[PDB]
Amino acid sequence: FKTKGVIKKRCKDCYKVKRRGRWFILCKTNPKHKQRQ
Amino acid sequence: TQLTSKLNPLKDEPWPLHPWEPGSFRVGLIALKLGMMPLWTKDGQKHAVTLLQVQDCHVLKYTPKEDHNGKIAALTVGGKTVSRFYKPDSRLEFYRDLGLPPKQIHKIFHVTDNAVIKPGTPLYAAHFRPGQYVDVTAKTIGKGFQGVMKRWGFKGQPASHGQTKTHRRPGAISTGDIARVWPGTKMPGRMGNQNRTVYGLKVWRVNTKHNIIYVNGSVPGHKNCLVKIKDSTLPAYKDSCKNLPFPTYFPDGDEEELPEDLFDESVWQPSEPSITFA
Amino acid sequence: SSFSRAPQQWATFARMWYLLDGKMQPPGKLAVIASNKLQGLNKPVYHQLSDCGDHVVIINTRHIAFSGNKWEQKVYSSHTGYPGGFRQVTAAQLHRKDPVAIVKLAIYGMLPKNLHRRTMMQRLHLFPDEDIPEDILKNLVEELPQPRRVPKRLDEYTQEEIEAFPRVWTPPDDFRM
Amino acid sequence: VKCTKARRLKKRNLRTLWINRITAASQEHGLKYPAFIVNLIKCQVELNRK
Amino acid sequence: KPIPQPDETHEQILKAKLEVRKSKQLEQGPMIEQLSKVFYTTKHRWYPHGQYHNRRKKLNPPRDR
Amino acid sequence: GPGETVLVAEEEAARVALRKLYGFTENRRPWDYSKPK
Amino acid sequence: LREVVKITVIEGRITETPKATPDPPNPSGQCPICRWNLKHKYTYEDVLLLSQFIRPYGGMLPRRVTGLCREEHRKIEECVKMAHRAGLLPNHRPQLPEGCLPKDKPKLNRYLTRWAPKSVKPIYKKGHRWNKVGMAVGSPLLKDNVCYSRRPLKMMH
RNA sequence: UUACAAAUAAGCGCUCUCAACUUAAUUUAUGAAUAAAAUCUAAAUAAAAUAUAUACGUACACCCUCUAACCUAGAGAAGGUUA
Ligand code: FES
Ligand SMILES: [Mg+2]
Ligand SMILES: [Mg+2]
Ligand SMILES: [Mg+2]
Ligand SMILES: [Mg+2]
Numbered sequence: 001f002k003t004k005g006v007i008k009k010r011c012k013d014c015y016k017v018k019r020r021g022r023w024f025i026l027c028k029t030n031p032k033h034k035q036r037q
Numbered sequence: 038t039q040l041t042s043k044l045n046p047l048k049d050e051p052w053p054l055h056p057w058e059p060g061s062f063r064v065g066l067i068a069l070k071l072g073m074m075p076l077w078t079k080d081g082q083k084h085a086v087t088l089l090q091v092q093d094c095h096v097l098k099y100t101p102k103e104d105h106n107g108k109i110a111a112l113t114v115g116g117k118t119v120s121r122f123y124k125p126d127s128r129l130e131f132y133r134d135l136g137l138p139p140k141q142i143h144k145i146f147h148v149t150d151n152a153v154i155k156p157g158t159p160l161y162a163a164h165f166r167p168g169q170y171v172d173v174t175a176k177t178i179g180k181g182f183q184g185v186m187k188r189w190g191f192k193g194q195p196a197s198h199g200q201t202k203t204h205r206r207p208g209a210i211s212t213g214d215i216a217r218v219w220p221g222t223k224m225p226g227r228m229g230n231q232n233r234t235v236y237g238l239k240v241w242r243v244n245t246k247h248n249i250i251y252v253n254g255s256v257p258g259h260k261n262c263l264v265k266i267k268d269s270t271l272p273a274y275k276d277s278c279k280n281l282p283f284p285t286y287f288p289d290g291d292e293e294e295l296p297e298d299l300f301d302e303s304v305w306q307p308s309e310p311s312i313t314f315a
Numbered sequence: 316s317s318f319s320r321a322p323q324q325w326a327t328f329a330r331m332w333y334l335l336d337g338k339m340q341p342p343g344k345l346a347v348i349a350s351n352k353l354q355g356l357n358k359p360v361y362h363q364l365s366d367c368g369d370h371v372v373i374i375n376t377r378h379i380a381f382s383g384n385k386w387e388q389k390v391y392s393s394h395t396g397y398p399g400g401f402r403q404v405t406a407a408q409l410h411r412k413d414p415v416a417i418v419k420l421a422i423y424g425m426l427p428k429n430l431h432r433r434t435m436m437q438r439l440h441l442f443p444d445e446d447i448p449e450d451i452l453k454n455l456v457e458e459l460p461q462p463r464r465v466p467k468r469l470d471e472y473t474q475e476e477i478e479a480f481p482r483v484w485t486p487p488d489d490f491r492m
Numbered sequence: 493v494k495c496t497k498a499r500r501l502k503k504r505n506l507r508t509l510w511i512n513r514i515t516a517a518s519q520e521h522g523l524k525y526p527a528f529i530v531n532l533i534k535c536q537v538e539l540n541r542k
Numbered sequence: 543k544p545i546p547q548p549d550e551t552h553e554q555i556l557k558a559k560l561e562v563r564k565s566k567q568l569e570q571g572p573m574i575e576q577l578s579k580v581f582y583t584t585k586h587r588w589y590p591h592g593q594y595h596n597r598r599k600k601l602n603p604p605r606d607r
Numbered sequence: 608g609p610g611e612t613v614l615v616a617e618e619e620a621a622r623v624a625l626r627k628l629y630g631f632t633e634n635r636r637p638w639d640y641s642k643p644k
Numbered sequence: 645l646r647e648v649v650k651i652t653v654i655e656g657r658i659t660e661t662p663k664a665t666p667d668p669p670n671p672s673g674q675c676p677i678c679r680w681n682l683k684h685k686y687t688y689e690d691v692l693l694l695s696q697f698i699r700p701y702g703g704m705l706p707r708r709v710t711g712l713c714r715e716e717h718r719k720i721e722e723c724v725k726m727a728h729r730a731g732l733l734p735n736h737r738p739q740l741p742e743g744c745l746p747k748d749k750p751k752l753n754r755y756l757t758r759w760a761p762k763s764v765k766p767i768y769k770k771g772h773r774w775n776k777v778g779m780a781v782g783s784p785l786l787k788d789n790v791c792y793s794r795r796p797l798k799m800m801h
Numbered sequence: 802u803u804a805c806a807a808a809u810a811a812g813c814g815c816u817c818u819c820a821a822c823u824u825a826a827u828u829u830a831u832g833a834a835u836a837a838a839a840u841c842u843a844a845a846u847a848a849a850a851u852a853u854a855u856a857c858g859u860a861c862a863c864c865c866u867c868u869a870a871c872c873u874a875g876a877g878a879a880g881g882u883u884a
């Protein structure tokens with residue numbers, strides 16, 4: 001989890017969710033791609 | 038005459054006896070602090086121990102759960118018979134109805150409903166048993182007005198190298214910005230003579246003939262001072278009353294007359310052979 | 316009219332006991348009503364020097380309701396006065412410890428910031444649930460309308476009421492539902 | 493100086509007292525203060541707040 | 543409602559509320575707390591004042607009708 | 608009639624009646640000093 | 645409405661469905677909301693309207709089945725969340741899978757709740773008069789509803 | 802052990818020290834919007850999970866004779882004791 005000002009999808013499998021009051025991109029293939037706002 | 042009349046509680050319409058159940062709290066005792074002596078265990082280690090003597094401990098007053106605190110009931114227990122000559126009439130009136138001579142101190146014990154005991158019931162040192170951890174509370178020794186060095190362990194100031202009339206003084210009270218002194222700031226004042234509690238003291242041995250409890254370590258207060266002794270409230274010893282006289286120990290029943298001295302297993306009794314670490 | 320001097324004065328300045336039900340009510344709206352009666356601002360004879368306030372009894376204060384996310388967003392702050400004695404508690408946490416605290420604090424702020432506010436708070440009686448002491452019940456004169464009309468739940472709606480409302484859309488036959 | 497300035501303030505404070513007392517009286521019958529005052533004016537009734 | 547005929551001067555009602563139970567006449571502290579609860583006031587109201595204020599009070603205040 | 612206690616209130620109500628029986632009500636017609644005759 | 649029955653052999657049986665009240669007041673409306681003149685006249689409190697678009701366990705029905713437009717589908721979805729959070733749908737509670745019981749924690753009464761109470765943090769620095777932090781009430785999606793007040797509704801409390 | 806070459810005070814001597822209702826990052830389970838054997842949910846939900854803290858316990862409670870004397874109580878006062 002890197003917290004970034006602007007969140008961007010990084011690969012095809014990346015998907016976006018709204019958990020606990022923030023936007024997350026989570027990638028099953030590459031955990032590196034996980035991001036938080 | 039009054040004391041003898043209260044010797045046999047079981048033959049004086051005792052309140053119903055209930056079984057022990059988890060979460061129960063028994064009544065405690067008030068004891069006099071005799072002094073200290075060394076005590077040795079079968080492993081050869083030496084333990085300083087304080088001697089607590091129960092003198093004329095009786096239950097005096099009972100308040101139901103509702104009338105004292107919704108959570109639990111209370112019992113008042115007094116010890117150490119005192120003179121009747123320099124006492125207020127209100128205190129003397131209270132004891133006259135109860136049929137007892139006045140006691141030096143009253144303390145309140147939170148006791149569950151099942152463990153309630155009728156007022157006027159004598160309490161004895163055999164209430165506690167060796168192997169039991171206990172909590173003792175008493176007023177600490179009074180040391181009078183004291184400075185910050187002795188009261189709060191302040192370092193002070195150097196003795197030499199030019200210090201001008203500043204050796205045992207407090208330093209800066211606070212910072213200048215707030216323009217005031219914080220409440221609770223540590224300052225010179227009267228030290229000691231406060232109620233303090235010592236937690237988790239083991240009971241090494243009980244003397245039935247003289248009603249002496251042997252408690253590990255130190256107890257607050259001076260010699261000949263009354264203390265309050267009750268089962269330990271520490272979580273580890275949560276339910277120890279399971280194997281102790283649940284309401285209290287009644288000599289009147291005398292199912293088996295107790296030995297003069299009761300010992301803990303680890304304690305090395307005097308008159309035993311010399312300890313050889315074989 | 317036609318009374319003697321003292322009975323007339325006694326009647327005019329007598330204090331009344333009112334009942335508020337706080338079930339499903341916002342504390343602020345309850346506070347507005349209670350603060351009005353406590354001061355005596357409901358009387359034409361009101362004067363700030365007359366001490367003409369009334370008794371307000373509020374029940375079901377445990378069952379008050381907040382709009383929005385105020386349960387988790389509204390914070391109550393206190394200081395013991397010692398270093399490190401600053402406490403901040405959310406509305407839900409304060410409600411859990413004391414069911415009656417939220418209503419009392421809302422009313423306290425609404426009363427005038429003077430010495431008479433402390434006296435007025437003595438006339439305020441807050442009970443977490445419907446149970447009231449018998450003596451307080453006998454004093455009661457009137458109950459006050461709830462400031463907020465409580466919306467009904469689905470189960471509360473009668474079968475006739477459901478039919479009255481139209482079926483806006485029809486689910487197709489080939490649906491799992 | 494306080495007495496002289498209080499002479500002007502006294503008149504304004506009395507009007508505030510009247511409006512509060514009128515609001516209490518009108519609310520007993522279910523009317524807000526603005527509704528009571530303006531609609532009485534619209535009836536050509538010129539009774540003052542005092 | 544019918545009047546409750548079975549059981550009255552306001553003094554009698556006052557006396558029962560301010561029953562003398564402990565230590566015969568109570569001190570200022572305990573007495574004032576008893577009075578404050580009965581009349582739903584605070585303790586501060588019941589304490590006396592010094593002689594500056596007592597001598598300032600008018601002997602004959604004006605009376606209207 | 609009003610009263611601090613029920614007995615006092617009832618006693619006051621007795622006086623309210625007697626006032627309305629002897630025509631001495633508080634809102635009774637004011638005394639007439641007009642007549643020069 | 646079709647239900648699946650299992651026996652392995654499993655089959656689905658279609659059942660007759662309750663029919664909509666005939667003759668809508670405003671025919672030619674695309675959305676079912678506008679065929680009854682409800683565009684700006686429903687809120688979270690209107691369980692009777694909201695319940696019709698809800699699955700038995702509280703989920704929203706898909707748009708392609710209800711036929712609502714996107715604008716009104718989002719309003720219904722948001723109103724349903726607020727209705728659920730206000731405890732106005734006691735019979736559409738989540739199904740308990742197995743060996744699960746309700747939390748048993750006492751329920752706080754709330755209404756007009758924009759966000760899930762779990763994920764909303766406390767306002768520790770509330771701010772002064774002009775930097776006051778606002779507590780959101782209601783939903784922005786319902787900003788166009790008919791208002792009977794002199795001034796617009798106070799969303800930020 | 803160091804003093805008062807006092808009956809005490811000290812440490813360099815000895816003893817005792819504990820529970821967490823409720824919660825953040827984060828991680829699981831059921832599950833719609835979104836046709837899924839999707840999705841941890843600023844959807845309805847069930848949980849686990851820092852440091853905090855006081856819901857929860859200990860301590861305190863008593864109601865007040867006091868010429869005077871004495872006190873391990875103390876500046877004074879207060880407080881304790883009196884066969
Ligand atoms: S209301 Fe008409 S398109 Fe939905
Ligand atoms: Mg030792
Ligand atoms: Mg001393
Ligand atoms: Mg030094
Ligand atoms: Mg020097």
Ligand SMILES: [Mg+2]
Pocket residue numbers: 214215216217
């Ligand atoms: Mg300052």
Ligand SMILES: [Mg+2]
Pocket residue numbers: 504
């Ligand atoms: Mg003006």
Ligand SMILES: [Zn+2]
Pocket residue numbers: 010011012013014026027028029030033
């Ligand atoms: Zn990726």
